[PDB]
Design an enzyme around this catalytic site. Structure first.
Site, PDB file in Angstrom:
ATOM      1  N   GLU A  45      80.159  23.990   2.422  1.00 63.30           N
ATOM      2  CA  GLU A  45      81.461  24.501   2.817  1.00 63.30           C
ATOM      3  C   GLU A  45      81.570  24.900   4.301  1.00 63.30           C
ATOM      4  O   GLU A  45      82.633  24.707   4.961  1.00 63.30           O
ATOM      5  CB  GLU A  45      81.843  25.684   1.908  1.00 63.30           C
ATOM      6  N   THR A  71      90.816  29.390   1.063  1.00 59.77           N
ATOM      7  CA  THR A  71      91.938  28.570   1.452  1.00 59.77           C
ATOM      8  C   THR A  71      93.187  28.906   0.620  1.00 59.77           C
ATOM      9  O   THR A  71      93.074  29.034  -0.609  1.00 59.77           O
ATOM     10  CB  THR A  71      91.654  27.097   1.252  1.00 59.77           C
ATOM     11  N   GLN A 106      89.772  33.773  -8.460  1.00 61.61           N
ATOM     12  CA  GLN A 106      89.232  32.511  -7.907  1.00 61.61           C
ATOM     13  C   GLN A 106      88.629  31.564  -8.954  1.00 61.61           C
ATOM     14  O   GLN A 106      88.996  30.390  -9.016  1.00 61.61           O
ATOM     15  CB  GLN A 106      88.252  32.751  -6.765  1.00 61.61           C
ATOM     16  N   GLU A 137      84.763  26.481  -6.248  1.00 55.46           N
ATOM     17  CA  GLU A 137      85.110  25.836  -4.966  1.00 55.46           C
ATOM     18  C   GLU A 137      86.190  24.787  -5.152  1.00 55.46           C
ATOM     19  O   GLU A 137      87.151  24.736  -4.377  1.00 55.46           O
ATOM     20  CB  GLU A 137      83.886  25.180  -4.289  1.00 55.46           C
ATOM     21  N   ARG A 138      85.991  23.938  -6.159  1.00 53.22           N
ATOM     22  CA  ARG A 138      86.951  22.899  -6.577  1.00 53.22           C
ATOM     23  C   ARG A 138      87.529  22.102  -5.400  1.00 53.22           C
ATOM     24  O   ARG A 138      88.744  22.078  -5.220  1.00 53.22           O
ATOM     25  CB  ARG A 138      88.084  23.526  -7.394  1.00 53.22           C
ATOM     26  N   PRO A 139      86.666  21.490  -4.574  1.00 59.92           N
ATOM     27  CA  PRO A 139      87.169  20.739  -3.414  1.00 59.92           C
ATOM     28  C   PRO A 139      87.863  19.433  -3.810  1.00 59.92           C
ATOM     29  O   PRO A 139      87.757  18.991  -4.954  1.00 59.92           O
ATOM     30  CB  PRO A 139      85.900  20.465  -2.600  1.00 59.92           C
ATOM     31  N   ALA A 140      88.593  18.832  -2.878  1.00 57.07           N
ATOM     32  CA  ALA A 140      89.271  17.555  -3.159  1.00 57.07           C
ATOM     33  C   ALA A 140      88.286  16.536  -3.731  1.00 57.07           C
ATOM     34  O   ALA A 140      88.594  15.860  -4.710  1.00 57.07           O
ATOM     35  CB  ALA A 140      89.933  17.013  -1.909  1.00 57.07           C
TER      36      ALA A 140
END
Length: 159
Positions: A45, A71, A106, A137-140
């Site tokens: 990250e 974010t 979160q 985190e669950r990013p794109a």
């Protein structure tokens, strides 16, 4: 001594930050495995840098900031101000993480593990890295197996 900057940290710089985090969260009840699972995510990250803005775009509060890339940054930043805490600060960000555990923020339970289970877990740092990736985190891009490699690297190389 910690590094706090808008700059990608080297492996040596990261180890300084990662040991600090491990010490701090141990005092607050987290297992070394859980912490290292989280450190593997923080490396991807932000290179475990509490001062880091997404893309190194300093001051863009609409996007990611800090160890876990909160974010939009503004939500974390707003939280710090309301708490009387400096936002660009290792301990402030670690306090945010504790606050999130305590208030069930979160985290989304996608892996049949709650945040409170997570911090007490003795599963492998790899498995924990993947749970933390998916739940917190669950990013794109969900395909970052490197995060588990890194969790194991910190588990082996920190005290």
């Amino acid at each position: 001594m910690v590094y706090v900057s808008n700059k990608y940290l080297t492996m040596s710089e990261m180890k300084v930050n990662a040991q600090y985090i491990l010490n701090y969260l141990s005092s607050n009840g987290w297992t070394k495995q859980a912490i290292c699972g989280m450190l593997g995510n923080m490396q991807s990250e932000s290179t475990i840098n509490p001062g880091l803005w997404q893309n190194l775009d300093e001051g863009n509060t609409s996007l990611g900031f800090g160890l876990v890339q909160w974010t939009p940054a503004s939500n974390y930043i707003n939280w710090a101000n309301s708490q009387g805490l400096p936002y660009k600060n290792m301990d402030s960000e670690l306090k945010r993480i504790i606050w999130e555990v305590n208030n069930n923020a979160q985290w989304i339970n996608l892996r049949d593990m709650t945040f409170k289970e997570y911090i007490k877990s003795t599963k492998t740092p790899r498995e924990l890295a993947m749970i933390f990736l998916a739940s917190y985190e669950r990013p794109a891009n969900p395909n970052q197996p490197e995060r588990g490699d890194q969790a194991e690297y910190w588990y082996k190389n920190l005290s």
